[PDB]
Amino acid sequence: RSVFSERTEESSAVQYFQFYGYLSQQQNMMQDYVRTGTYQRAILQNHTDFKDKIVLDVGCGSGILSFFAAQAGARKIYAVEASTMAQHAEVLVKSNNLTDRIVVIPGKVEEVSLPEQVDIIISEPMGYMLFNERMLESYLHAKKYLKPSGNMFPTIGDVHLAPFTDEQLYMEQFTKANFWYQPSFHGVDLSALRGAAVDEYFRQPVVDTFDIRILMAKSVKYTVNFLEAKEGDLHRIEIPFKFHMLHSGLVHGLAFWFDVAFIGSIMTVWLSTAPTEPLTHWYQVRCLFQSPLFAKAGDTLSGTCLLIANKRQSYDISIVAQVDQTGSKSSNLLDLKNPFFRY
Amino acid sequence: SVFSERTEESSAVQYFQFYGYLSQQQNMMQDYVRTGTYQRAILQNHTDFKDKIVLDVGCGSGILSFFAAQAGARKIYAVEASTMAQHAEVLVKSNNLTDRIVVIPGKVEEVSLPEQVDIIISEPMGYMLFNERMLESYLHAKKYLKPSGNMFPTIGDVHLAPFTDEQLYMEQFTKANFWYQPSFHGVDLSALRGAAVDEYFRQPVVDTFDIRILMAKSVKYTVNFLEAKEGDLHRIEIPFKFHMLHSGLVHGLAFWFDVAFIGSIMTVWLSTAPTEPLTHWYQVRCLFQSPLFAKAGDTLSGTCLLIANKRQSYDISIVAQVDQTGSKSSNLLDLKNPFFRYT
C-alpha cells in the first residue's frame, strides 16, 4: 500500500486532484509573476546545476518547471504529476519539441516507477502557510530517487510567525459568529449554539494580506531543510516561540508567511511570501485568538505552535500563547484545510 | 441503500462536510426571501400542521421544524445526515421542544421513522433546482407519507429562456487566450488554448442579470412532488420551442425555478426568477459553444437533457437550432462545477 494512500483519506485525494485538473487553476498559479519569475531565475541563474543532469519534477502541473530545467540544459527530466493535468503537460512537451528531454510520468510520486536516479529534484510543494497540502512530504519522499550528491530546488523552507493586532479582522469574524447569539431569529432561540459558532469561525485561518504595521514583534523562524529532513519529520511540527513585544496593545493572533531558498552552486535565490515583499497567490495566513491577549511593550509572549498532520492533506493547528508578565493565556485550535479566503 | 448506490462516497463526504458548518446554515438562514417565505408558507397554512405528524427532510439546524411547531404540529421528525443534526438537537432542547421535535441523524434513505406522517417539509432545491440531487431524497421520503399526505413544497417549476450576453460570451476567450502565446517565459502555450476554451464553456454561470437580455418567453418544466418518483429525475428531458421576441445573437440558455407550497388555506410561491428579489440560488446560465442568430419571430427549438451523475449533480446537454436557418449549436456542461460570476 502506497505511502500516499496510507496517510490520505481517498475522499480528500479525489477533491484535491480534481482541483488541480483545471487549466484555469494552472493559469492562476502561472500568472503569479513573482512565483513563476522567481522559479525561472533560480533555475536559469543556476544552470550548471542542471546542464546535462537528470531532473525529477515533482507535481509538475502543466510542466513549466520542467521547461525551465530544459532551458537550463538538463539532459533528461522526469515530470511526475498525479492530476489529469499530466495529459496537458504531455501536449505542451510535444508542441514545444521537447519529447527527447521531458518525460511525463502520470501518477503519485509515491506510486510511480522512475527509470533512474536523478541529480536534482525540483518542485512547488508549498501550500498556503507552507504546510497545507502535505506536498512537502511527497517532495521529501521523492528523495528515494535522488543521488547521494543530489540537490533539492527549493532546498530549505522558513516559516515565520509574528503576533499581530487587527481589531477590524477580529470583530469581522466575531460579528459573523454572533448571528448564533440571537434569542428570537424568526422566533427561534439560537443562543445555545453561540459557543459552537465562535469555535467554528475562529477555527478558520484567514488567508489575506495586511500592512506590516500590524505586527507587534519580530518574527520567529522555523526552518525545514529539505536536503536533510525525512517524511516523518512533518507528521508533528512543534514551533515554540518567545516574542519580545515591541508595541503595546491587543494581540489578536499570530500571522504566518514563508520563504524558500534555492541553494544552487552559482547563487542562492529566495522566494518570499513575506508581507514586506510583493504579494503572491499564497498571500499570508493569520490564526485568530478567540479572546485577544493584552500585552505591553517589553513583555514576552511565549507559547508553542503545534501542527499535527491529518488524513485530509493538511494540519490540525494548535496555538497556545501566554503573556508571561500577567499569565494571560489563550489556547486555539484551527483547521488549516478550511480557511477563510478574505482577500 | 438507495443513497449509497447512487452517490460516490467521495462526493458525499465533501457534500455533508459543507453542510456541517454553522456558517453555511447561517448563509441560507440570512436569505430572508428563502427563510421568510418558508415561514409564511407554513404559518399561513396552519391547518395543514395543527396536531399533525410532520417529517422534515434535510433539516439542517432545524428551522423548518421550528416553523412547523409554531404552526402547531404535534410531532415533527427532523432527519439530517450531516453533523448539523447534533446542533439541531441542541436547539430543540434549548427551545424546550423535545416533546414535539425528534432529530433523527442520518440519511432519509437509511433511517427508520416510528410512524407515517401527514406532511413532508423540505428544502431540496439546489441551484438550477436539480443540483444536489436532493429532490430524489425528498421523493424517496414519500414512503413515510400517509395516502392523503401533502408536501411542502408541493411542486417545482424550472424555467428556461434564451439570452444574449455578448460580453459574457467573449469573456470565455479572453480568459482562455492566456494560453495563446508563443513564449510564456520561453514556453509555447498555444496548444492548450482549445482545451482551456472547452473547460470554460463546460461551466454553468451562477449570477444574476437584467431581464432585458432574455429574448423569448420562458418554457416551464414542472415536477409534481406528490406524483413524481425518484427515477423520473435520473433523465430529465426539457424540449423547447422558443418564439423569439427580439432579433439578435443567442449566446445560451438561462435557468431559474419556482416552488409552490399548495396548502389547504392558500398557495405560497418561492421564486428565484430574475424578475424577483435575488436569492442565494441566483440564476444559472449555460452558454452555447457558438451563438445563434435569430430574427424576432423566428423559432429556436431544441432540447435540454439533464443526466444525473454519482456526484450529486447532473451532466447538462443542450442542443438548439434556429428553424428558419438551420443554424445549430450545442454545449455540454458540468452542473457540479459552476463559475460564480456575481460580484
Binding site: F19, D32, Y128, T280, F341 | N27
Partner: peptide
C-alpha cells in the same frame, strides 16, 4: 464565501 472546501490554492491577486 465563508467555506470553499475544494479550493487548495488561493486565487492570485
Amino acid at each position: 464565501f465563508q467555506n470553499m472546501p475544494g479550493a487548495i490554492r488561493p486565487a492570485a491577486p
